[PDB]
Amino acid sequence: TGKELLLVLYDYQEKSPREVTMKKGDIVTLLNSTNKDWWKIEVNDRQGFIPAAYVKKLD
């Protein structure tokens, strides 16, 4: 039933090639939450990892 949306809690600039930048208040798509520390998301045309603590699932 489609990928889950998350709310971005904090602005975050990518710090490595695998990461992605996001802005507070963005609604991003969860791609992979298997890691407890880093989740893979889609933020429009871009995808990458961010700190799991900095996003909240919109169940």
UniProtKB/Swiss-Prot annotation:
What is the annotated localization of this protein? Cytoplasm, Cytoskeleton; Cytoplasm, Cell cortex
Q: Where are the transmembrane segments?
A: none
List residues of the SH3 domain.
1-59
What family does this belong to?
Belongs to the spectrin family.
Q: How does it assemble?
A: Like erythrocyte spectrin, the spectrin-like proteins are capable of forming dimers which can further associate to tetramers. Interacts with ACP1.
Job description of the protein: Morphologically, spectrin-like proteins appear to be related to spectrin, showing a flexible rod-like structure. They can bind actin but seem to differ in their calmodulin-binding activity. In nonerythroid tissues, spectrins, in association with some other proteins, may play an important role in membrane organization.
Name of the featured protein: Spectrin alpha chain, non-erythrocytic 1
Q: Which residues of the full protein are shown?
A: 967 to 1025 of 2477
